Protein backbone atom coordinates (compact mmCIF):
# COMPACT_ATOMS: atom_id res chain seq x y z
CA UNK A 1 0.00 0.00 0.00
CA UNK A 2 1.39 3.38 -1.04
CA UNK A 3 1.57 5.26 2.26
CA UNK A 4 2.71 8.83 2.88
CA UNK A 5 5.04 10.11 5.60
CA UNK A 6 4.76 13.79 6.54
CA UNK A 7 7.71 15.30 8.40
CA UNK A 8 7.25 17.97 11.07
CA UNK A 9 9.70 20.20 9.20
CA UNK A 10 7.76 20.15 5.94
CA UNK A 11 8.21 17.24 3.54
CA UNK A 12 6.04 14.31 2.45
CA UNK A 13 7.67 10.99 1.56
CA UNK A 14 5.89 8.24 -0.36
CA UNK A 15 6.76 4.70 0.72
CA UNK A 16 5.27 1.44 -0.56
CA UNK A 17 4.73 -0.81 2.46
CA UNK A 18 2.38 -3.56 3.60
CA UNK A 19 0.08 -4.19 6.61
CA UNK A 20 2.48 -6.80 8.01
CA UNK A 21 5.46 -4.47 7.63
CA UNK A 22 7.18 -3.70 10.93
CA UNK A 23 7.66 -0.09 12.00
CA UNK A 24 11.38 -0.77 12.33
CA UNK A 25 11.35 -1.82 8.68
CA UNK A 26 9.71 1.46 7.69
CA UNK A 27 12.32 3.46 9.59
CA UNK A 28 15.02 1.60 7.65
CA UNK A 29 13.39 2.57 4.35
CA UNK A 30 13.36 6.21 5.44
CA UNK A 31 17.05 6.10 6.34
CA UNK A 32 17.77 4.80 2.84
CA UNK A 33 15.85 7.77 1.45
CA UNK A 34 17.11 10.69 3.54
CA UNK A 35 19.79 9.97 6.14
CA UNK A 36 18.10 10.19 9.54
CA UNK A 37 19.30 7.25 11.70
CA UNK A 38 16.43 4.96 12.83
CA UNK A 39 17.17 5.80 16.46
CA UNK A 40 16.08 9.33 15.54
CA UNK A 41 12.61 9.12 14.02
CA UNK A 42 9.49 9.44 16.18
CA UNK A 43 6.55 8.22 14.10
CA UNK A 44 3.04 9.23 15.14
CA UNK A 45 -0.40 8.58 13.65
CA UNK A 46 -4.03 9.49 14.32
CA UNK A 47 -3.68 7.29 17.40
CA UNK A 48 -0.37 7.95 19.14
CA UNK A 49 3.33 7.13 18.81
CA UNK A 50 4.33 3.98 16.92
CA UNK A 51 6.84 1.64 18.57
CA UNK A 52 9.35 -0.64 16.86
CA UNK A 53 8.51 -4.28 16.15
CA UNK A 54 4.76 -3.74 15.83
CA UNK A 55 3.36 -3.74 12.30
CA UNK A 56 1.33 -1.18 10.35
CA UNK A 57 -1.55 -3.57 11.05
CA UNK A 58 -1.57 -3.06 14.82
CA UNK A 59 -2.77 0.48 14.12
CA UNK A 60 -5.18 0.01 11.23
CA UNK A 61 -2.91 2.21 9.12
CA UNK A 62 -4.38 1.82 5.64
CA UNK A 63 -3.02 3.09 2.33
CA UNK A 64 -2.36 6.73 1.48
CA UNK A 65 -2.06 7.31 5.23
CA UNK A 66 -0.08 10.33 6.40
CA UNK A 67 2.35 9.34 9.15
CA UNK A 68 3.91 12.15 11.18
CA UNK A 69 7.67 11.94 11.69
CA UNK A 70 9.66 13.90 14.27
CA UNK A 71 13.43 13.44 14.10
CA UNK A 72 15.53 14.05 17.20
CA UNK A 73 17.58 17.09 16.20
CA UNK A 74 19.63 17.22 13.00
CA UNK A 75 20.52 13.65 12.05
CA UNK A 76 23.76 13.86 10.07
Amino acid sequence: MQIFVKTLTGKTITLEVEPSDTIENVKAKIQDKEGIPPDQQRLIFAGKQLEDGRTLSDYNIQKESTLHLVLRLRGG
Binding site: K6, T9, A46, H68, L73
Partner: protein, 131 residues
Protein backbone atom coordinates in the same frame (compact mmCIF):
# COMPACT_ATOMS: atom_id res chain seq x y z
CA UNK B 1 26.12 31.37 43.48
CA UNK B 2 26.79 33.43 40.36
CA UNK B 3 26.83 30.56 37.87
CA UNK B 4 29.06 31.01 34.82
CA UNK B 5 25.87 30.81 32.77
CA UNK B 6 25.38 34.50 33.55
CA UNK B 7 28.63 35.54 31.88
CA UNK B 8 27.53 33.45 28.91
CA UNK B 9 23.99 34.73 28.37
CA UNK B 10 25.50 38.16 29.04
CA UNK B 11 27.82 38.24 26.03
CA UNK B 12 25.19 36.79 23.71
CA UNK B 13 22.63 39.15 25.25
CA UNK B 14 24.52 41.92 23.46
CA UNK B 15 24.80 39.85 20.29
CA UNK B 16 21.00 39.84 20.15
CA UNK B 17 20.67 42.42 17.38
CA UNK B 18 24.36 41.94 16.58
CA UNK B 19 24.25 40.46 13.08
CA UNK B 20 22.92 36.91 13.36
CA UNK B 21 25.59 34.61 14.78
CA UNK B 22 25.85 30.82 14.89
CA UNK B 23 26.79 31.08 18.56
CA UNK B 24 23.26 32.00 19.58
CA UNK B 25 21.65 28.67 18.68
CA UNK B 26 25.04 26.99 19.11
CA UNK B 27 24.64 27.64 22.84
CA UNK B 28 20.97 28.36 23.49
CA UNK B 29 19.54 25.53 21.39
CA UNK B 30 21.68 22.88 23.16
CA UNK B 31 20.74 24.24 26.59
CA UNK B 32 17.19 23.57 25.41
CA UNK B 33 17.64 20.81 22.84
CA UNK B 34 20.55 18.58 23.87
CA UNK B 35 18.09 16.32 25.68
CA UNK B 36 16.77 17.99 28.82
CA UNK B 37 18.88 20.65 30.53
CA UNK B 38 17.28 23.00 33.11
CA UNK B 39 13.90 24.27 31.92
CA UNK B 40 14.22 27.56 33.81
CA UNK B 41 17.31 29.02 32.14
CA UNK B 42 16.25 27.27 28.93
CA UNK B 43 12.96 29.15 29.21
CA UNK B 44 14.49 32.63 29.00
CA UNK B 45 16.69 31.26 26.22
CA UNK B 46 13.76 30.04 24.14
CA UNK B 47 12.37 33.58 24.16
CA UNK B 48 15.72 35.02 23.07
CA UNK B 49 15.39 32.99 19.87
CA UNK B 50 11.83 34.19 19.25
CA UNK B 51 12.39 37.93 19.57
CA UNK B 52 15.65 37.57 17.65
CA UNK B 53 14.63 35.11 14.94
CA UNK B 54 11.23 36.79 15.08
CA UNK B 55 11.58 37.44 11.35
CA UNK B 56 13.07 34.34 9.74
CA UNK B 57 12.06 31.07 11.41
CA UNK B 58 13.28 27.50 10.95
CA UNK B 59 11.89 24.02 11.58
CA UNK B 60 14.97 22.72 13.38
CA UNK B 61 14.17 25.33 16.01
CA UNK B 62 10.66 23.98 16.56
CA UNK B 63 11.50 20.29 16.20
CA UNK B 64 14.11 20.59 18.95
CA UNK B 65 11.85 22.77 21.07
CA UNK B 66 9.24 20.05 20.58
CA UNK B 67 11.42 17.15 21.70
CA UNK B 68 11.84 18.93 25.03
CA UNK B 69 8.12 19.69 25.18
CA UNK B 70 7.39 15.96 25.28
CA UNK B 71 10.20 15.17 27.71
CA UNK B 72 8.06 17.26 30.06
CA UNK B 73 7.53 15.54 33.41
CA UNK B 74 4.41 17.50 34.33
CA UNK B 75 5.96 17.26 37.79
CA UNK B 76 8.09 20.41 37.58
CA UNK B 77 4.92 22.43 36.98
CA UNK B 78 5.94 24.05 40.27
CA UNK B 79 8.38 26.44 38.62
CA UNK B 80 7.01 29.11 36.28
CA UNK B 81 7.94 28.74 32.62
CA UNK B 82 4.82 27.43 30.88
CA UNK B 83 4.02 31.00 29.82
CA UNK B 84 7.23 31.73 27.92
CA UNK B 85 7.13 28.20 26.50
CA UNK B 86 3.62 28.75 25.15
CA UNK B 87 4.09 32.31 23.88
CA UNK B 88 7.11 30.86 22.08
CA UNK B 89 5.23 28.26 20.05
CA UNK B 90 2.99 31.21 19.22
CA UNK B 91 5.02 34.30 18.33
CA UNK B 92 7.25 31.81 16.50
CA UNK B 93 4.82 31.43 13.60
CA UNK B 94 2.61 34.11 12.05
CA UNK B 95 1.13 32.55 8.91
CA UNK B 96 2.96 31.22 5.86
CA UNK B 97 1.63 27.75 5.04
CA UNK B 98 -0.76 25.88 7.33
CA UNK B 99 2.31 25.72 9.56
CA UNK B 100 0.55 26.14 12.90
CA UNK B 101 -2.30 23.97 11.63
CA UNK B 102 0.15 21.07 11.49
CA UNK B 103 1.46 21.85 14.97
CA UNK B 104 -1.97 21.65 16.60
CA UNK B 105 -2.45 18.40 14.70
CA UNK B 106 0.63 16.92 16.36
CA UNK B 107 -0.27 17.95 19.90
CA UNK B 108 -3.54 16.09 19.38
CA UNK B 109 -1.68 13.14 17.87
CA UNK B 110 -0.30 12.37 21.33
CA UNK B 111 -3.53 12.41 23.34
CA UNK B 112 -4.90 15.67 24.74
CA UNK B 113 -3.27 16.58 28.09
CA UNK B 114 -3.28 19.95 29.84
CA UNK B 115 -1.86 21.18 26.54
CA UNK B 116 -5.31 22.74 26.17
CA UNK B 117 -3.79 26.09 27.11
CA UNK B 118 -1.59 25.86 24.02
CA UNK B 119 -4.35 24.50 21.79
CA UNK B 120 -6.68 27.42 22.52
CA UNK B 121 -4.03 30.14 22.62
CA UNK B 122 -2.05 28.95 19.60
CA UNK B 123 -5.45 28.04 18.15
CA UNK B 124 -6.56 31.67 18.18
CA UNK B 125 -3.41 32.99 16.53
CA UNK B 126 -2.77 31.60 13.05
CA UNK B 127 -4.10 33.21 9.88
CA UNK B 128 -4.42 36.94 9.22
CA UNK B 129 -6.13 38.73 12.11
CA UNK B 130 -4.17 41.64 13.56
CA UNK B 131 -3.85 44.16 10.74
Amino acid sequence: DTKISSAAILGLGIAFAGSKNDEVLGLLLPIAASTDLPIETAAMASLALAHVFVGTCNGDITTSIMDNFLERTAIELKTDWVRFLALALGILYMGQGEQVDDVLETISAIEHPMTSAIEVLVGSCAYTGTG
